[PDB]
Design a protein around this ligand. Structure first.
Ligand SMILES: CCCCCCCCCCCC(=O)OC[C@H](COP(=O)(O)OCC[N+](C)(C)C)OC(=O)CCCCCCCCCCC
Ligand SMILES: CCCCCCCCCCCC(=O)OC[C@H](COP(=O)(O)OCC[N+](C)(C)C)OC(=O)CCCCCCCCCCC
Ligand code: SF4
Ligand code: SF4
Ligand code: SF4
Lengths: 121, 210, 380, 123, 59, 130, 63, 190, 85, 120
C-alpha cells in the first residue's frame, strides 16, 4: 500500500507550502512500522544507529498509538506540527533505507595523515 | 548554564561519531561551536544524516568555503556550515581536497549550495564532482589564476588600460606607481599569548591510572 | 521545440530567457563589483581590517561593522562593557530603521510608487545626521571597534534621538497608509515570489524571507547578543511565502526597532564604553602622554596591533537583509589568516531562478526588491 | 538553481585515459565547429582559419601530459572556456587575450643573443 | 563625569502602535447618498428633456 | 540650453551612488538650477570602484555619447584606485579608461563636495564656449 | 467587432426620438444578441494569459 | 516529561495552528457594502488624500551654495599639518600615521638635522587613495595631523590631488582657529 | 523669510538668519553674496563663518576677530621664515 | 569608570581574559576508544597505576578498534556515555532555548485580516 505524507493543496496552516493532512495518525503509524521493519531487517544488532532509532520510533509511536487528539500529541512529541512530523518521519525512514546500503557501522575506510588536523598550536 | 551546555555539546558529538564510525574521523569543540572532521569520500552520507535524522536535522546550508594551508600535503580544507532552524543549533563539517583531486558536491541535497560551491571554486580551485554549472563567478572572465590562494600575489599578475592603437582595452603585466609595502615584517618576536586553560568537562578526558 | 530569446536585463547584469512574456529560466550574472575585499584583509591588522566591512553592504553599515567586531571579540576572549552593549544595540537598530527605510521605499519605486522614495529620503537624512554627529563621515562610520565602541556619545545626542523617535511613528504611519491598503500595491504583490517552508531552508534563505514563509527564527531572540537579551522585543512572521508578506514584515520591523530605540534611551546606564585594558585598544590621549606604559601601549597597538589567540569562529548576526555571518581564522598573529563574509543577499540572488519561474516579466521586478539586492553583498 | 545554463555539462571525472581522450576529442570538435560563430560574435579583424589554428595550437600545448587527473582538470578548464566563449559572456577585449602576437608588432629590438638582452639588462 | 545620561524619571512613552483612526463613513451611507444624488440628477435631466421637446414643438 | 540644464547619465556603481541620490533627496535637491540625477546627454559621472570586469563596459557607455562630452569622477575609489588600490581585480582610477575633467575627492564625498564639483565643472563648460 | 457595433449604435443615438417605442426594442434586441457573444468570450477566459508557475500540488506518495 | 528524542521543549506554541481562512459567507460586511468599497475605490482616495496633505506643508529643501547642512565638530574633510604657537611644525617624524593607514596613503621621508630634533623632509598623502577613517588623527601623539572640516576642494587634475608637505602646512595655516576650536571641543571625549 | 542681519564679514557678504526656533527642518542661516555676477559661482567665504553656517559654532564671530585672524596668519609667515632659517 | 584604573589593588592578571582562553577539544578516532574503555576522570575504570599506563599505551598505539570498543561495551556504558540515560539519542543542543509566545489580541501589530502575526 501507499501513504501520503504531505498535502500540497488544501486549507492553509502557518507554514506555507504545507497544507492540512487528512488522517495523519494512520499515515504516521504505518510509516513508523515501515521504519521498525526496515531497521530490524537490515542493520546488525551491535550498531548504535539502529538501537537509538528503534528506541526513538518506539517511544514516538507509543505517544501516537496511545493518545487521540491532534494538539496534545503535537505537544507531547515536542517537535513540530503533525504534517511536519509526518514529513520528518518519512525523511528518517528514507535515511534508514539509505543506511542499509551505505553501511555506516564499519570501521573507517580513509584514515587521515598524521600531519593533517594540525592547525596552529 | 554555559559550562553545562558546552559539556552537553561534547556528549552530543560523541554520540554522532558513535552512530557513524565509518565516516567520521574526529570532532572538536571550541566554545559552543561543533566541527565534524570528515574524509572527502565521506561527505555525501554524513550530509544526508545531518539533513535527515530527527535528532540531527540541519536542513539549510548557510555558507561553505575552503581555506588553504600550503604546508599540508592535502592543501585545501573545505568547511561546511549548517543551521538546524528547529533545534536552534549550528554545526560545522570539514573535509580536505588537494588542488587536483575533488570533493563531491552536496548540491543534490542542498539547493542553495551550488552558488556557494562555484564561489569557493573560483576563489580556491577546489572541485565539486557532480555539479551542474561549475565555472567561475565574481572574477574576470579571462582571468587566469585563483585569487584567494597563497601563491597568488596581492596585486595580481595583470592590469587594464586603454590602448589608443587597437581602440580597445588591453591586458598587460603588472606595473605599479607605488609598490605595496607590507608591514607584517616587524611583528612581535615574543610569543604573544599563552597556551590557555581548557573547557573540557571532567567526563571526557582520559582517566589517570590510580 | 520552444525557442526562448535572451536579453541583457546598483551594477548588475542578468540574463533572461523569455518565451513571450514568461520567464522559463533566469541566470543572474554577478562579479562586476568584485574588488577583492576578502583577500586584502589578510594583509591588514584587525584595527585596519575594520573599514572593509562598511565598504560592503554599505546601506546598513554599522551592522556589517558589528558582525566582524563580534567574531573578533569571541576569538579574543574579551568582553565589551555594559554601556558599550546598549550603545551598539541602539546604533544597530537605527541602522535597521535606515536599511528598511531604503529597502521598502526602493521596492516601492521599482514597483512604481514614487512618493515614498522621496519621503523616505528626508527621514533617512535625519538618520545620517545621527551618524554624522557620532563618527566623522556620513555613510561610513567605523564606530564599533573590535575592543568595544570607538568613543563616547556627544553631550546632547540622546535627547535628539528621542526627539526623532517621537515624530517618526507618525511619519511612518503616513507612508504606510498609502501602500498597505492600496489595490495596485496589493494586486501586483500577493502571489509573486512564493517560497515554501521546506525550500526556504534548502535555498539557505534567512531573515525576512525565512520569516516570510512562516518559520519563527531570528538570531536576536534565538541566540542573542549585545544586550538584545536585556531589551524587550517582539518579532513578526508572516503566513504566505509571497512578496507582500515580506513587505509586511518590513513594515512591522520599523515599529519594533522604534520600540527598541525608546527602550535603549530610557534604560541607558553610565559606564566605560571601551574595554578596560590597553593591550587591545588605545589609551586616552590625556594619559597616553603622562604615563610611560600607556605611551608604550599606544605605540605597540599602532605599529603592530593587538594579537589574537589561534582558532576559528563563525559569528552570525541578523543584518536587516538576513543572516550575515563572518568566518575568521586566526593564525595567532596580528593579521587574520583568512576571513570570509556570508553576505546575506548572496543566497537570496542564488535562490532567484527557483523562485522566479513562471512569473511575468514585471513580475521579475517586484521579486527583486524583497530579496533586497544591494550588490555590495553579492559580489564582494 | 535547478536548471543549468545552455551548453553546460555536469562536471564528472573519468577513471580511464581513453574515455578522457574521447571527451577531449568531442571537445575539440565543439571548438572547431563553433569557430565561425566567434568571428561574427566578437567582431575580430582576422580570418576563421587563424581561430582554428589557434585552437589547434592551444591543444598542442598539453599534448604530452601524463597524469590522468591533470588531464581531468585541463578538460574541465577547457570546457569552462568553451562555455564562456560560445555565449556572449566574454567580451571582445578578453577574447583577444588569446591573440597578443597577431594584433600589432611592438617595435624594433626583440633581443635574441646575449648582447641584445644585455644592452637593456634582460628587459 | 560629563557623559550623557537619560533623565532620572525617564522619558515619556512614544507611539509605536498603528494610528489609523477611522474617518470614512459607512459604505451604505455613501451609496445612499450616491443613489440620491443620481436620482435627483435624472429628475432634472429628464425634466429638461421634456421642456426642450415642448420648445421644439413651439419652433 | 546646455548651461541651464544638465542631465548626467550617472554611472553610480557602488557606495557613492547613494550619496549621489542624496542630491536627488529633498535636502540637497539641486532642483533649482536644474540637475536631475533621476533616470543620451553629454556628461557621465563615475562614482565607485571600477573593477577589472567593467572597464570595457565603462568605455562602451562612454563611447555612445554625443561628441561635446565631459566626465567627472566622484569618490576616491573612482580616481586612483582608492581603498582597493592594491587589489588584483580593480582599475586604479578611471584615468586608465576615460579622460576625466574634474575630480571630486572623498571616500564618501558629501553631497556638498559633489555639488561643488559640479559647479566647478559648469564654469569649465561655460569658459569652453564650444 | 466591438468597435464596429459602436458605429452600428451611432445611427440610433441621433434618431432616438423618431423611433419611439419600436426602434427601442430593436436596439435592445440587437444589444442583447451582442451580450451573449460577450458572455461567450468571458465564459471561455479568452483574454487571460497563463503560465506554468504551479507545482500542480500533488501529494507526496510513498512506496 | 522526557521528550521523544529528535525533539525538544521548543514545541509549536499554543495557537500556531492558524484557523481556516473564512469563506465568503462568514464575512461580517454585506456584499453591497463590500461592492461600495470595490467600485468607488475607497482606499485609493485615502492615499490620494495623504499626498494632498503633503502638498500643503513647508518643504525640507536647502540652498547649497549659500547654506551648508548641519555638521559635527568631529567631522572629517581635507587634511592639515598643524603647528605650535610660537611657530613650530609639530610633526616629529615619529611614523605612526604611516603605519596605521588602511589604504597606505601616507608616505614620509624623515631626516635629522644638527639640532637633534626630528622632522620630515617629505610628507605626502595621496588623496586618490585616502579613505577618511581618521585613524591618522588618532595615532599621532603630538596632535600634528588633523581633519579639517572642509569638503569643498574638488580639483580638476590628479597631480593637484597629491598633497605634499607644503599644501598641508598651508591647510594648517588657513584652518587654524576653527581647527583649534573643534579639537578643544572634541578633547573631552578623546 | 523674515531676515535678520547677524553678520557682516571681512569680504563684504551679509550673513542673514531667518525663521528661527519654530521648525526643526527649517533652514535657518543663509548669506547674500552681494555679487550677482552672471553665471559665476565662486565666493570666498572666510573659514570662521563656514562653521557658523554648519551649526557647529553657536557663538557669533566678530569682524575684528576676522581681521585679527588675517593679521595672525601674516605675522606667522615672518615667524615661519625665521624658523626655517 | 574608576574600578578599572584604581591605584591600589589591580594586578593585570586577575582581570586578564585574553590569556585564560579555552583550547579546542579535538578528539581523534582513538581517544574516543580511550573514553569508552579506560573510562574518564569522572568515572575511571582503571586500577594498577603501573599497569594502567601499559593498558593505555596499546590503545594509544592502535591495539583495539572502535567497532571492537562498541562491541565490547556494556549496556551501562552505552546508555551512560554514548546514549542518554533513557536510551535516547541526545537532541542537537542549543545554548539559550527560545520559547515562543503568540500575541493575538489588540496588543498585536496587525489586526485579523492582515496575514502577519507578531509572535514574541
Ligand atoms: C483629516 C483627518 C485625516 C483623514 C485621513 C483619511 C480621510 C480620507 C477620506 C476619504 C474617504 C475614505 O477614505 O472613506 C473610506 C470609507 C471606509 O469606511 P469605514 O470606515 O470602513 O466604515 C466604518 C464607518 N465608521 C467608521 C463611521 C464606523 O470607504 C467606504 O466605505 C466607501 C467609499 C467612499 C469613497 C468616496 C469617494 C467618492 C468618489 C465618487 C465622487
Ligand atoms: C428606475 C426608476 C424607478 C424609480 C422611480 C421613482 C422616481 C420618483 C417618481 C418622480 C416622478 C416625477 O414626478 O418627476 C417628473 C420628472 C419630469 O418632471 P416635469 O418636467 O415637471 O414633468 C412634466 C409634468 N407634466 C407631465 C404634467 C406636464 O421626470 C423625472 O425625471 C423623474 C425621474 C426620477 C429619477 C429616476 C431615475 C432612477 C435612476 C435610474 C438610473 C440607474
Ligand atoms: S569611493 Fe568610497 S564610499 Fe564610494 S564606493 Fe568607493 S569605497 Fe565606497
Ligand atoms: S584618514 Fe585614514 S586613509 Fe586618510 S591618511 Fe588618515 S589613516 Fe590614512
Ligand atoms: S603626523 Fe603624527 S604620526 Fe605622522 S609623522 Fe607627524 S607625529 Fe608622526
Amino acid at each position: 500500500q501507499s501513504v501520503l505524507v504531505q498535502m500540497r493543496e488544501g486549507t492553509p496552516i502557518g507554514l506555507t507550502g504545507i497544507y492540512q493532512h487528512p488522517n495523519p495518525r494512520p499515515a504516521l503509524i504505518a510509516l513508523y512500522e515501515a521504519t521498525l521493519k526496515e531497521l530490524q531487517d537490515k542493520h546488525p544488532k551491535d550498531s548504535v544507529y539502529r538501537q537509538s532509532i528503534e528506541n526513538l520510533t518506539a517511544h514516538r509511536k507509543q505517544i501516537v498509538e496511545d493518545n487521540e487528539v491532534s494538539e496534545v500529541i503535537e505537544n507531547k512529541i515536542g517537535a513540530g506540527l503533525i504534517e511536519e512530523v509526518v514529513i520528518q518521519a518519512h525523511e528518517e525512514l528514507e535515511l534508514a533505507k539509505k543506511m542499509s546500503e551505505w553501511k555506516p557501522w564499519e570501521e573507517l575506510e580513509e584514515k587521515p595523515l598524521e600531519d593533517q588536523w594540525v592547525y596552529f598550536n | 548554564r554555559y559550562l553545562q551546555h558546552v559539556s552537553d555539546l561534547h556528549q552530543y558529538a560523541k554520540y554522532i561519531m558513535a552512530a557513524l564510525p565509518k565516516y567520521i574521523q574526529g570532532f572538536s569543540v571550541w566554545k559552543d561551536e561543533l566541527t565534524l572532521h570528515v574524509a572527502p569520500s565521506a561527505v555525501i552520507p554524513v550530509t544526508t544524516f545531518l539533513r535527515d535524522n530527527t535528532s540531527t536535522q540541519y536542513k539549510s546550508i548557510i555558507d561553505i568555503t575552503a581555506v588553504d594551508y600550503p604546508s599540508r600535503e592535502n592543501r585545501f580544507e573545505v568547511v561546511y556550515n549548517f543551521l538546524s532552524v528547529r533545534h536552534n543549533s549550528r554545526i560545522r563539517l570539514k573535509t580536505y581536497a588537494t588542488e587536483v583531486t575533488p570533493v563531491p558536491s552536496i548540491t543534490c541535497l542542498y539547493e542553495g549550495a551550488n552558488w556557494f560551491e562555484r564561489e569557493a571554486y573560483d576563489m580556491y580551485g577546489v572541485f565539486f564532482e557532480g555539479h551542474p554549472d561549475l565555472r567561475r563567478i565574481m572574477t574576470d572572465y579571462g582571468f587566469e589564476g585563483h585569487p584567494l590562494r597563497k601563491d597568488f600575489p596581492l596585486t595580481g599578475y595583470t592590469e587594464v588600460r586603454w590602448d589608443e592603437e587597437k581602440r580597445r582595452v588591453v591586458y598587460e603585466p603588472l606595473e605599479l606607481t607605488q609598490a605595496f609595502r607590507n608591514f607584517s615584517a616587524g611583528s612581535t618576536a615574543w610569543e604573544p599569548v599563552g597556551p590557555g586553560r581548557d573547557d573540557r568537562p571532567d567526563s571526557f578526558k582520559l582517566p589517570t591510572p590510580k | 521545440r520552444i525557442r526562448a530569446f535572451t536579453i541583457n536585463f546598483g551594477v548588475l547584469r542578468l540574463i533572461l530567457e523569455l518565451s513571450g512574456e514568461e520567464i522559463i529560466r533566469s541566470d543572474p550574472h554577478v562579479g562586476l563589483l568584485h574588488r577583492g575585499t576578502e583577500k586584502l584583509i589578510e594583509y591588514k591588522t584587525y584595527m585596519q581590517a575594520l573599514p572593509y566591512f562598511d565598504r560592503l553592504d554599505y546601506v546598513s553599515m554599522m551592522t556589517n561593522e558589528q558582525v566582524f567586531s563580534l567574531a573578533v571579540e569571541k576569538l579574543l576572549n574579551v568582553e565589551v562593557p555594559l554601556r558599550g552593549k546598549y550603545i551598539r544595540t541602539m546604533f544597530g537598530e537605527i541602522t535597521r530603521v535606515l536599511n528598511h527605510l531604503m529597502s521598502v521605499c526602493s521596492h516601492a519605486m521599482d514597483v512604481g510608487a514614487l512618493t515614498p522614495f522621496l519621503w523616505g529620503f528626508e527621514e533617512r537624512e535625519k538618520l545620517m545626521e545621527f551618524y554624522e554627529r557620532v563618527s566623522g563621515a556620513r555613510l561610513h562610520a567605523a564606530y564599533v571597534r573590535p575592543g568595544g565602541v570607538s568613543q563616547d556619545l556627544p553631550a546632547g545626542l540622546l535627547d535628539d534621538i528621542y526627539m526623532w523617535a517621537t515624530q517618526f511613528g507618525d511619519r511612518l504611519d503616513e507612508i504606510e497608509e498609502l501602500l498597505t491598503d492600496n489595490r495596485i500595491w496589493k494586486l501586483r504583490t500577493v502571489n509573486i515570489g512564493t517560497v515554501t517552508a521546506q525550500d526556504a531552508l534548502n535555498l539557505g534563505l534567512s531573515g525576512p524571507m525565512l520569516r516570510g514563509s512562516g518559520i519563527p527564527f531570528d538570531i536576536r531572540k534565538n541566540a542573542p547578543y549585545d544586550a538584545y537579551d536585556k531589551v524587550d522585543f517582539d518579532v513578526p512572521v508572516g503566513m504566505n511565502g509571497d512578496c507582500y508578506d515580506r513587505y509586511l514584515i518590513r513594515m512591522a520591523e520599523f515599529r519594533q526597532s522604534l520600540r527598541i530605540i525608546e527602550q535603549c534611551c530610557n534604560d541607558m546606564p553610565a559606564g566605560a564604553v571601551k574595554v578596560e585594558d590597553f593591550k587591545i585598544n588605545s589609551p586616552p590621549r590625556n594619559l597616553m602622554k603622562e604615563d610611560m606604559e600607556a605611551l608604550i601601549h599606544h605605540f605597540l597597538l599602532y605599529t603592530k596591533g593587538y594579537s589574537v589567540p589561534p582558532g576559528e569562529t563563525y559569528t552570525a548576526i541578523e543584518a536587516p537583509k538576513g543572516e550575515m555571518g563572518v568566518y575568521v581564522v586566526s593564525d595567532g598573529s596580528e593579521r587574520p589568516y583568512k576571513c570570509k563574509i556570508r553576505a546575506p543577499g548572496f543566497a537570496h540572488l542564488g535562490a532567484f531562478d527557483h523562485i522566479a519561474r513562471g512569473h511575468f516579466l514585471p513580475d521579475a521586478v517586484a521579486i527583486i526588491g524583497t530579496m533586497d539586492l544591494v550588490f555590495g553583498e553579492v559580489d564582494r | 538553481a535547478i536548471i543549468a545554463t545552455a551548453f553546460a555539462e555536469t562536471v564528472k571525472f573519468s577513471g580511464s585515459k581513453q574515455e578522457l581522450q574521447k571527451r577531449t576529442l568531442a571537445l575539440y570538435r565543439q571548438f572547431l565547429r563553433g569557430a565561425p560563430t566567434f568571428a561574427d560574435l566578437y567582431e575580430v579583424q582576422f580570418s576563421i582559419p587563424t581561430i582554428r589554428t589557434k585552437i589547434r595550437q592551444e591543444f598542442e600545448r598539453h599534448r604530452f601530459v601524463d597524469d590522468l587527473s591533470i588531464q581531468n582538470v585541463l578538460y574541465a578548464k577547457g570546457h569552462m572556456e568553451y562555455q564562456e566563449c560560445i555565449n556572449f559572456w566574454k567580451q571582445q577585449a578578453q577574447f583577444l587575450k588569446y591573440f597578443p602576437e597577431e594584433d600589432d608588432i611592438q617595435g624594433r629590438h626583440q633581443p635574441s643573443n646575449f648582447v641584445d638582452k644585455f644592452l637593456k639588462n634582460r628587459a | 563625569v560629563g557623559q550623557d545620561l537619560p533623565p532620572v524619571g525617564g522619558y515619556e512613552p512614544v507611539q509605536w502602535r498603528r494610528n489609523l483612526p477611522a474617518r470614512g463613513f459607512r459604505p451604505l451611507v455613501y451609496l445612499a447618498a450616491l443613489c440620491g444624488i443620481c436620482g435627483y440628477g435624472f429628475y432634472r435631466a429628464l425634466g429638461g428633456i421634456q421642456e426642450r421637446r415642448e420648445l421644439k414643438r413651439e419652433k | 540650453a546646455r548651461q541651464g540644464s544638465f542631465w548626467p547619465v550617472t554611472f553610480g556603481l557602488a557606495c557613492c551612488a547613494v550619496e549621489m541620490m542624496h542630491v536627488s533627496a529633498p535636502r540637497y535637491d539641486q532642483d533649482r538650477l536644474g540637475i536631475i540625477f533621476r533616470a543620451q546627454s553629454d556628461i557621465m559621472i563615475v562614482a565607485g570602484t571600477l573593477t577589472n570586469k567593467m572597464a570595457p563596459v565603462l568605455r562602451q557607455v562612454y563611447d555612445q555619447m554625443p561628441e561635446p562630452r565631459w566626465v567627472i569622477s566622484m569618490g576616491s575609489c573612482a580616481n586612483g584606485g582608492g581603498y582597493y588600490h592594491f587589489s588584483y581585480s580593480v582599475v586604479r582610477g578611471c584615468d586608465r579608461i576615460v579622460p576625466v575633467d574634474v575630480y571630486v575627492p572623498g571616500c564618501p564625498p558629501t553631497s556638498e563636495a559633489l555639488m561643488y564639483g559640479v559647479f566647478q565643472l559648469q564654469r569649465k563648460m561655460r569658459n569652453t564656449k564650444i | 467587432p466591438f468597435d464596429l457595433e459602436i458605429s452600428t449604435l451611432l445611427p440610433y443615438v441621433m434618431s432616438i426620438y423618431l423611433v419611439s417605442n419600436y426602434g427601442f426594442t430593436i436596439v435592445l434586441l440587437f444589444l442583447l444578441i451582442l451580450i451573449i457573444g460577450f458572455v461567450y468570450e468571458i465564459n471561455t477566459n479568452a483574454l487571460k494569459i497563463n503560465k506554468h508557475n504551479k507545482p500542480n500540488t500533488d501529494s507526496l506518495i510513498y512506496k | 516529561n522526557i521528550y521523544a528524542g529528535g525533539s525538544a521543549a521548543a514545541a509549536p506554541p499554543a495557537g500556531f495552528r492558524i484557523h481556516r481562512p473564512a469563506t465568503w459567507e462568514e464575512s461580517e460586511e454585506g456584499a453591497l457594502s463590500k461592492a461600495t468599497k470595490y467600485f468607488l475605490l475607497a482606499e485609493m482616495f485615502r492615499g490620494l488624500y495623504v499626498v494632498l496633505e503633503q502638498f500643503f506643508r513647508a518643504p525640507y529643501t536647502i540652498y547649497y551654495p549659500f547654506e551648508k547642512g548641519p555638521v559635527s565638530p568631529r567631522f572629517r574633510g581635507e587634511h592639515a599639518l598643524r603647528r605650535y604657537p610660537s611657530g613650530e611644525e609639530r610633526c616629529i617624524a615619529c611614523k605612526l600615521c604611516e603605519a596605521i593607514c588602511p589604504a597606505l596613503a601616507i608616505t614620509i621621508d624623515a631626516e635629522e638635522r644638527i639640532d637633534g630634533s626630528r622632522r620630515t623632509t617629505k610628507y605626502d598623502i595621496d588623496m586618490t587613495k585616502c579613505i577618511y577613517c581618521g585613524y591618522c588623527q588618532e595615532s599621532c601623539p603630538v596632535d600634528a595631523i588633523v581633519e579639517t572640516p572642509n569638503v569643498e576642494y574638488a580639483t580638476e587634475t590628479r597631480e593637484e590631488l597629491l598633497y605634499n608637505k607644503e599644501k598641508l602646512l598651508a591647510n594648517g595655516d588657513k584652518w587654524e582657529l576653527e581647527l583649534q576650536y573643534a579639537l578643544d571641543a572634541d578633547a573631552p571625549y578623546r | 523669510k523674515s531676515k535678520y542681519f547677524v553678520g557682516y564679514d571681512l569680504d563684504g557678504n551679509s550673513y542673514w538668519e531667518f525663521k528661527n526656533v519654530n521648525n526643526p527642518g527649517r533652514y535657518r542661516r543663509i548669506v547674500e553674496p552681494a555679487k550677482p555676477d552672471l553665471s559665476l559661482v565662486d565666493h570666498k567665504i572666510p573659514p570662521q563663518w563656514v562653521q557658523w553656517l554648519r551649526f557647529t559654532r553657536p557663538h557669533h564671530p566678530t569682524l575684528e576677530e576676522l581681521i585679527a585672524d588675517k593679521q595672525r596668519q601674516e605675522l606667522l609667515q615672518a615667524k615661519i621664515a625665521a624658523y626655517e632659517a | 569608570s574608576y574600578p578599572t584604573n584604581d591605584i591600589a589593588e589591580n594586578p593585570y592578571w586577575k582581570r586578564d581574559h585574553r590569556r585564560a582562553y579555552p583550547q579546542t577539544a579535538f578528539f581523534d578516532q582513538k581517544t574516543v576508544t580511550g573514553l569508552l574503555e579506560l573510562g574518564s576522570e569522572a568515572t575511571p575504570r582503571i586500577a594498577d597505576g603501573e599497569a594502567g599506563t601499559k593498558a593505555l599505551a596499546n590503545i594509544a598505539n592502535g591495539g583495539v578498534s572502535f567497532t571492537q570498543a562498541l562491541g565490547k561495551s556494556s549496556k551501562d556504558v552505552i546508555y551512560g556515555e554514548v546514549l542518554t540515560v533513557n536510551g535516547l539519542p541526545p537532541v542537537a543542543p542549543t545554548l539559550a532555548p527560545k520559547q515562543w509566545k503568540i500575541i493575538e489580541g489588540e496588543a498585536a501589530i496587525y489586526p485579523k485580516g492582515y496575514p502577519c502575526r507578531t509572535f514574541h
